[PDB]
Structure formats: structure tokens, C-alpha cells
Amino acid sequence: ASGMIVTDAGADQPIVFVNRAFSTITGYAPNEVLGRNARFLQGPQTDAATVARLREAIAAARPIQERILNYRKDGQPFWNQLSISPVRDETGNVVAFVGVKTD
Amino acid sequence: ASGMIVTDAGADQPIVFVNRAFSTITGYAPNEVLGRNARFLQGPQTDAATVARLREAIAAARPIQERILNYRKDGQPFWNQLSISPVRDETGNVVAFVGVKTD
Ligand SMILES: Cc1cc2nc3c(=O)[nH]c(=O)nc-3n(C[C@H](O)[C@H](O)[C@H](O)COP(=O)(O)O)c2cc1C
Numbered sequence: 001a002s003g004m005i006v007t008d009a010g011a012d013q014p015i016v017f018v019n020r021a022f023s024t025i026t027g028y029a030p031n032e033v034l035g036r037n038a039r040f041l042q043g044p045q046t047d048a049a050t051v052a053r054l055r056e057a058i059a060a061a062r063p064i065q066e067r068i069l070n071y072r073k074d075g076q077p078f079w080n081q082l083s084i085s086p087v088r089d090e091t092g093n094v095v096a097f098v099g100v101k102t103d
Numbered sequence: 104a105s106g107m108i109v110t111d112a113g114a115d116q117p118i119v120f121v122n123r124a125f126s127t128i129t130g131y132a133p134n135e136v137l138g139r140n141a142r143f144l145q146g147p148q149t150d151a152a153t154v155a156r157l158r159e160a161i162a163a164a165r166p167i168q169e170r171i172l173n174y175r176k177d178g179q180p181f182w183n184q185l186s187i188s189p190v191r192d193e194t195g196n197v198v199a200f201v202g203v204k205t206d
């Protein structure tokens with residue numbers, strides 16, 4: 001199974017759902033992450049240019065894939081092959097964002 | 104806000120998340136629907152041919168949009184402009200399905 005994060009569309013994209021795989025991968029339980037922006041997964045060695053590309057894509061509701069250095073709850077660095085896409089209604093309104101970690 | 108349902112990919116797509124708009128629209132709380140296939144929203148005058156097109160598209164992990172008759176918890180019918188899409192990882196594995204109601 002691949003990790004999955006779902007966020008609200010607006011106002012800095014707080015997490016509303018993580019799948020079981022997310023907790024296996026990151027060591028974080030759902031209650032520890034709901035209502036937070038996913039940027040808490042980043043750490044000292046995270047590439048700022050990669051973070052900026054995610055920021056611009058999410059702001060514009062553009063799909064993006066990045067290999068980004070993330071950090072488990074226990075602090076272990078892991079490479080996150082991250083893909084983010086908007087969820088739209090048929091009018092084109094953004095309803096949510098979905099992020100997947102590909103192992 | 105538009106209604107959104109997220110399901111597992113496999114084994115008859117049990118619901119794993121519904122947004123707040125889902126509960127406003129349908130009258131169901133998350134604890135009433137999590138772990139169930141979304142077909143409980145259908146009822147006696149739901150169009151069988153429409154349900155068959157949804158079944159075939161989801162089985163194939165193909166996006167689909169239909170206008171389908173659904174029923175609130177209290178039994179009141181509502182027209183659901185429903186769009187369902189797979190969520191894939193970068194290997195092409197289906198991680199989840201997402202369903203949206205367009206007002
Ligand atoms: C649905 C979704 C999932 C995300 N998943 C991750 C993730 O797994 N790891 C990560 O470092 N950032 C993730 N992000 C990105 C951060 O939330 C944030 O958008 C990014 O750090 C850029 O914004 P900032 O410069 O304001 O931090 C995700 C964003 C969204 C919308």
C-alpha cells in the first residue's frame with residue numbers, strides 16, 4: 001500500500017484524512033496530524049527549492065511530483081516520492097488536495 | 104463546499120473518509136458510513152443502468168460522471184451530480200477512489 005494524505009482546499013491545506021500506510025511510513029497516528037499542514041514532515045536537510053515548487057503548485061492547484069526528504073515521528077529521514085493533485089468538482093472548484101507517497 | 108467521499112481501492116471500496124459537506128448533504132455522520140460501500144445512498148427509484156455504468160467504471164478504475172438519485176438518512180430523495188475518479192501512485196497502482204457531488 002502507498003501512503004495517502006487528504007487536505008482541505010483552502011487556508012493552508014490542513015490534513016483531514018491519512019490512510020493506514022501513512023502511519024506505517026511516517027510513524028504518526030491520525031490524531032497527531034489532523035488539522036495540521038503536512039510541512040511538519042520536513043526537517044533540517046529538506047531542499048528549500050523543492051518546498052518552494054510544492055508551495056507554488058498547491059497555491060495554483062497544479063499537479064506536482066517531487067522527491068523530498070521527510071522525517072518520521074522518531075526523526076529518521078526518508079525519501080518521499082510525493083505526488084500532489086487537486087480534487088475538483090465538475091464546475092472546476094477545488095474541493096480537496098490528495099498527496100501520495102510512491103514506494 | 105462540495106460533498107466528497109474517499110474509499111479504499113480494493114474489495115468493494117469501503118468508505119474511509121467523508122468531508123463535512125457530505126454530512127450536511129446526506130444527513131449521515133462519518134461513524135454511520137465509514138467501512139461501508141456508498142451504495143447505501145441509493146434507493147427504490149435509483150436508475151439500475153446508471154448504477155451498472157458506475158460499477159463497470161469503478162471496476163476498471165476509469166473516471167465517471169453520472170446524475171443519480173440518492174436518499175438522505177431521513178429517506179428524502181436528492182439528485183447527485185456524482186463524479187468518481189481513482190487516485191493512483193506513480194507506479195499506476197490505485198490507492199483510493201474519490202467521489203464528489205457538484206452543486
Ligand atoms: C495533500 C497534500 C499532501 C502533502 N504531503 C506532503 C508530504 O508528504 N511531505 C511534505 O514535505 N509536504 C507535503 N505537502 C506540502 C506542504 O503541505 C506544503 O504545501 C509545502 O511545504 C509548501 O508550502 P510551505 O512553503 O508553505 O511549507 C503536502 C501538501 C498537500 C496539499
Ligand SMILES: Cc1cc2nc3c(=O)[nH]c(=O)nc-3n(C[C@H](O)[C@H](O)[C@H](O)COP(=O)(O)O)c2cc1C
Nearest residue numbers: 108110116140141142144145154157158200201202
Ligand atoms: C469513491 C466513491 C464514491 C461513491 N459515491 C457514491 C454516491 O455518492 N452515491 C452513489 O449512489 N454511489 C456512489 N458510489 C458508487 C457505489 O459505491 C457503487 O460503486 C455503485 O453502486 C455500483 O456498484 P454496485 O452495482 O455494486 O452497487 C461511490 C463509489 C466510490 C468508489
